[PDB]
Design a binder for this molecule. Structure first.
Ligand code: 5VL
Length: 156
């Protein structure tokens, strides 16, 4: 897709020029070694001063041929404990749905910051995995304990 690839090159240039510290976002490679702009490997650092601090949380960002009409699918690999992350790893977030709050102008940087913000502030209206959601609702102290253990597990 010429339209998607042109925009993704634009995103890559912008990201490399200016991006938040500790974040990573890079396109992958095709089997022949060439760059594959439709599939990115990213990492989001936990915010300091939060239970996510010190963790580095890896995720894949997958673009459809009609991007930026459509949002990327964003999928934590491996899956994360969080009320709004499906067991598959896929992120449940309104800016990542075409029929909700996605806008074509939204940047990869805005997506990754949006997901970082989600990590530390779950949306109770969007339960995506039963366990983390139930614990978040029932016992915030236990919830944060599980989150800190997870951050340690994924320390760089
Ligand atoms: O290992 C990484 C280091 C830095 C940034 C991304 C990754 C990654 C993200 C998703 C899937 C695989 C990966 O290797």
């Amino acid at each position: 897709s010429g339209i998607a690839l042109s925009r993704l090159a634009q995103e890559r240039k912008a990201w490399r020029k200016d991006h938040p510290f500790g974040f990573v976002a890079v396109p992958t490679k095709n089997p022949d070694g060439t760059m594959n702009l439709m599939n990115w490997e990213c990492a989001i650092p936990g915010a300091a001063g939060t239970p996510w601090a010190g963790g580095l949380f890896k995720l894949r960002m997958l673009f459809k041929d009609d991007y930026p009409s459509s949002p990327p699918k964003c999928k934590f690999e491996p899956p994360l404990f969080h009320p709004n992350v499906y067991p598959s790893g896929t992120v449940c977030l309104s800016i990542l749905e075409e029929d909700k709050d996605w806008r074509p102008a939204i940047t990869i940087k805005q997506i990754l910051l949006g997901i970082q913000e989600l990590l530390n502030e779950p949306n109770i209206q969007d339960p995506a995995q039963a366990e983390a959601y139930t614990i978040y609702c029932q016992n915030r102290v236990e919830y944060e304990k599980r989150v800190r253990a997870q951050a340690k597990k994924f320390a760089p």
